Design a protein around this ligand. Structure first.
Ligand SMILES: Cc1cc(Nc2nccs2)nc(N2CCC[C@H]2c2cc(-c3nccnc3C)no2)n1
Length: 271
């Protein structure tokens, strides 16, 4: 657990209060090493006067986050758990959640979307590399969706990186086995990854839009799948359908998904 002195941490603005207590944008000194300097950070706080039951949950969250060191997984830089309020220090993803970033790219201008197909494919590659790491760690996320991913930039012209954020009812993202049997495997995360790349390729559309949570479980259990995104490339729709195979055993691995996305990216770039 990366113990960090709260004296080297400064809280500057409030990002929100949708987790344990509040999330702050701040700065940390020497968090990446003694002479590294001041770096921008996100700070997950646990409210002072929190119950023992809440402290243990915060401690669990810090233990899970300490296991992840990958460019496409949100990184925990340090923790302040000796005193109250408790802090979980994270790398700052200034662009916010991927769903909002996608929706704003579609709904901002008249000329066209602020994200091209090649920008979208690179978002899929970034997420799939994060999933390969998780599959290798034998970690099952349980909630892979665009709302649970973060973007490093807020603009649409700078180089960007998408990271898998907060770790796991979200019915539209759940595979059929999770819905009826409560089975949660890396192959059910593969189902969710296909839902997330559909979200990316539609620039933030809600899956199964005409349907409700009860209609979704009925429709999906009986073989019904999402309609293809408008002008979606064939090889991307091929991989999306592979991810939604009724049997988890028939669904491809994350290592295969990364290769197929990489092969499509090369096939697309050569044209
Ligand atoms: C414009 C911005 C940037 C940012 N950046 C962050 N960077 C790191 C953690 S939060 N956060 C935010 N927020 C708005 C709500 C509160 C805070 C937030 C979002 C997340 C998050 N989201 C998706 C997946 N996983 C996580 C942990 N956590 O706090 N708005």
């Amino acid at each position: 657990l990366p113990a960090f002195p709260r004296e080297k941490l400064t809280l500057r603005l409030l990002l929100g209060s949708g987790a344990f207590g509040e999330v702050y944008e701040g700065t940390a000194v020497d968090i990446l090493g003694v002479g590294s300097g001041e770096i921008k950070v996100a700070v997950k706080t646990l409210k002072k006067g929190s119950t023992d039951q809440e402290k243990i949950e915060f401690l669990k969250e810090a233990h899970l986050m300490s296991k992840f060191n990958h460019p496409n997984i949100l990184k925990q830089l340090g923790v302040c758990l000796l005193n109250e309020p408790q802090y979980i220090i994270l790398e700052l993803m200034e662009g916010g959640d991927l769903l909002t970033y996608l929706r704003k790219a579609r709904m901002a201008t008249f000329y066209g979307p602020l994200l091209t197909l090649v920008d979208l494919v690179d978002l899929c590659v970034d997420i799939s590399k994060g999933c390969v790491y998780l599959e290798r760690m034998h970690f099952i996320h349980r909630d892979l969706a665009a709302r649970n991913c973060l973007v490093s930039v807020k603009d649409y012209t700078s180089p960007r990186i998408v990271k898998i954020g907060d770790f796991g009812l979200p019915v539209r993202w759940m595979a059929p086995e999770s819905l009826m049997d409560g089975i949660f495997t890396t192959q059910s995360d593969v189902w969710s990854f296909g839902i997330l790349i559909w979200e990316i390729l539609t620039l933030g559309h809600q899956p199964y839009p005409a349907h409700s949570n009860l209609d979704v479980l009925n429709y999906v259990q009986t073989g019904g799948r999402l309609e293809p995104p408008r002008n979606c490339p064939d090889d991307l729709w091929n991989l999306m359908t592979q991810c939604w195979a009724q049997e988890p055993d028939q669904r491809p691995t994350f290592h295969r998904i990364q290769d197929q996305l990489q092969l499509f990216r090369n096939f697309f770039l050569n044209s």
